[PDB]
Structure formats: structure tokens, C-alpha cells
Amino acid sequence: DNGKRRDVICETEFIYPFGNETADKEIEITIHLKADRQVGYLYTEIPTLKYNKDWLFLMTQDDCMHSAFSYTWAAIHGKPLSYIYYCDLAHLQNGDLPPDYYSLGKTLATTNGTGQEVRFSFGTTVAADDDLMNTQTWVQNGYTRDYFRFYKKTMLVWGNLQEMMNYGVSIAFHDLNLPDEDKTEDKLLAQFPVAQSMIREKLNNRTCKMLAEPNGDKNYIKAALRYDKIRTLCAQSGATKLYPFQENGDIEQVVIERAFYDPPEGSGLTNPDMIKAAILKEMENPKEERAAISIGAHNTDTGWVNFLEWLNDTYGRDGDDSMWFTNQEEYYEYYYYRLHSKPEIKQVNTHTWKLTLNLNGEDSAPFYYPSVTVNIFGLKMGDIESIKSNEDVTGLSYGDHKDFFMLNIDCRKYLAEHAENFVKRYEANPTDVSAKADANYFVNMLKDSDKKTELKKRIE
Ligand SMILES: [Zn+2]
């Protein structure tokens, strides 16, 4: 019965197997040149920003907000949106949508510089030790007497967050669930692994490695720095302002500055208005002098949806494609690779070169964004007869960029299986246009292979 009320625990049918991700990657890419395109010398680098982007936008949404799913994630990923209501995952799965629902008609993304979509990425804080994440969702297709089931919940339900993990959304600690008088440095330190155990239980054994400082409370930073699973942190004060082209040191356990860009009281402006103004001011400088635009958000809304669309239209795929819009965890990992991984290219014979690189994360937990860009100077796409790669490479896209050649290399161990899970979801929901779009998006992340060919055929 489609019209009967059900109260369910939101659940998604697969979650990327974060616990199984391999910590160490060994990249070997073999480049075979055309006969009359023998080159004498090639050399390589990992550029400052992934995809050879010019500038960095970081976004972390605090307070484990329902709108992180219903507004932020939904707008990026081409999902149904509302102007005043808050869908849960089960509403989307069942087609029980609020009475004002609409869609932007596109996802919000940059490209990777080699012809593929890269949807905007962000992080959300998680109230993992708070039982309110276990709240049920009321689903009732066709019920119009009221819309209470679409009201804002106090925080995300676990199923919403689980699904967001499938799209690369990151996670951070924030407030911990202790009495206020027990929020001492020592007691917060003991509670971090308790919250971590719940994160791992619910998010397929993903380990959280980030703290977003809550309430300006420096006890959280002091405690977090004694908990070695946390590798990156953000705060509005007591932090380091990130200049991506200038930062030269280790950022392990460093507090990166973030700002909320609150508008002056009664000025009629919104946080997105303030962030837009800050972006425009920053873009007047040469890229090497620019600070990262490192933002926090609380509740997101229609104004935020329109702002994300403006970013897409101005600096993303429908604009100048100059921005890397990501979460702080993915950036932290990329910076780590750039500092510690050393790509090398060696000539094998007159017409064959081999590019090698290791991606090794930190000893605490496996890094979850093992993808990099490598530039090759002295090579052009037109020189190349074929490119082959070893098993650790699961995604591989490449092409010319300015006067050199770039490769986007993804080493997520279970990427092909993840794409196939999106294909199976589409096959089970073949009339859902967004499901088909997601399947195509994830399949296009894969390197050329028999599996990619099989999955493409299934989603024709
Ligand atoms: Zn907060």
C-alpha cells in the first residue's frame, strides 16, 4: 500500500567500504609514443591544486544539520529540492516529495581539466554520540493533509549521512555529547574515541580525522591534539590562514582558519552575500597570493542553493572552471601527497616512458581521497599512441593543459565496485533520471577497462 503511513529508519543500500581502503598505493603508468613523436626528455610535478585549479574553496557545514542533506548535498547532486521543507533519504527513495519541490536541472560541479565532471565537495560535522541521529522518518506518499513529515529535524539522521558518504562528502567532529560541566580537556579527550566508534559502526568503518571547533571552545582543540586520529582541524581564531601557493610546512594537526562571513546586524545581507564579496576581492590578486576561501556554514537554505549555483556558473563547469571546491579532508590529503610523494618518469625504450609515484597516507587511518594530478612537461596528447596503468589505478583521465600534459589519477581501491552499485541502483529504479545520471557520473570516473565497458552498456 503506497498511501499508508510508515515510520522508518532511513537506510541506503550500499556504502563505500571505507574500512577496506588500502593505505598504500603504487602508481605505474606506461606511456607509449607515436613513431615520429619520440621526445628527448620529460619531467613531472604534482601541481599546487588538484586538476591544475587556480584557487581553493573549502566548505564545512557545522551542527550536523538536516539542511546539509536537504539543501547542500541535494543541490550539488541534482536531487529534488524544496524552498521551505527538509527531505530525508527515504522521501527521495519513495518519491514522497514536499508540495513545493523543484530541481535546478543540473548538478553543481567543476571539471577535472580532462573532460570529466567533478561535483562540488564539502564536509559536515557529525553528532555521532547523540541519539537524535536515530530519529525515524515519516513517509506517506500522496498524503497532503499536512506536511509535518518534511519539517526540519534537530540534526541529520544516520541514513542521510550514510548516503552522503557515497558522494565523497567528508565528516568532522564538533560538539561531543557530554554535560557542559564535563567539557574539560581530559573528558573531551576520552569522549573522542566513543564518538569515533559510532562513526565507524555507522559509516562502514570510515575513521573521522577532522575537528571543526565548536562554540569558540579551545578545550576542543587542546583535547583533539591529544587524540592522534585527528589530523586536521579548523577554527575561526587561533588558526593558520591557508595560502595554498605559499604554504610550505607540515600541516599535520594544524588548525586551518575558516570564516562564517556573518553579515552586519540589520544590514539585510546574507552569509552568501558576504562570501561572494570576499571571493570577488580575493580574485583580484594573482593566484599565488590568494588565500583559500575557507568557509563554515550553519543552516543552508534557498539563498545557499542559489549561491552554490552562482559558483558553478562563475568559477565552475559553467564558468571559468578555475576553482577547486572541496572539503578540508580531501585537501589535507592532497597537500600531504604533494609534500611526500615524488613522481618520477623514466624512459624504458625509445618510444616508451614509465611514470611512477607512491601515494602513502598517514599511519592513523587510510586516507580516503587517494587521487592526484600529475603534470608531464615535454609531452602532448598528440604524441601519445597509448597509455596503460597498473591495478592500483582505478580512475585515469588525461589531456593537454596549457603547454603541458596532465593526468588525473584515482586510486580508490573499490571505485569500480562503487560505480557498479550506482548502476545496480539505476537498474532497480530505471525511471529515475537522477539515478541514471549518477550511474553515468560514477562510471565515467573509471579508467578504460572491460568493467567500464560492461557498466556503460548497462546504462545506455
Ligand atoms: Zn556549532
Closest to 47 in 3D by CA, of 268, 377, 278, 294: 377
Q: How far is the CA of 168 from the centre of ligand 1 (A)?
A: 22
Instruction: Extract the C-alpha cell encoding 147.
Output: 506536511
Of 113, 87, 73, 82, residue with least CA distance to 100: 82
DSSP per position, 81-123? B-SS----HHHHHHT---TT-B--SS--EEE-SSS-EEE---E
Residues with CB under 5 A from ligand 1 (ion): 62-63, 214
Is 174 annotated to bind a ligand? Reply is yes
- Give the residue carrying C-alpha cell 562513526: 199
Residue 428 burial (CB count, 10 A):
10
| Ligand 1 centroid distance, CA of 223 (Å) | 17
Alpha helix positions (H), 225-301: 271-283
Phi, psi of 239 (to 5 degrees): -135, 175
CA separation (Å) from 439 to 301, 444, 456? Answer: 27, 8, 9
Helix (H) or strand (E) holding 151: none
Rounded to the nearest angstrom, the distance between the alpha carbon of 324 and the centre of ligand 1 is: 25
At residue 425, φ and ψ (nearest 5 deg) are: -65, -45
Distance 395 CA to ligand 1 centre (A): 36
Grid coordinates belonging to 397: 583521465
Domain ranges of the chain: 1-460
The 3 state secondary structure assigned to 304-315 is HHHHHHHHHHHC
Candidates 351, 360, 415, 342; CA nearest to 383 is 351
CA of 63 to the centre of ligand 1 (A): 5
CA 215 to ligand 1 centroid distance, Å: 6
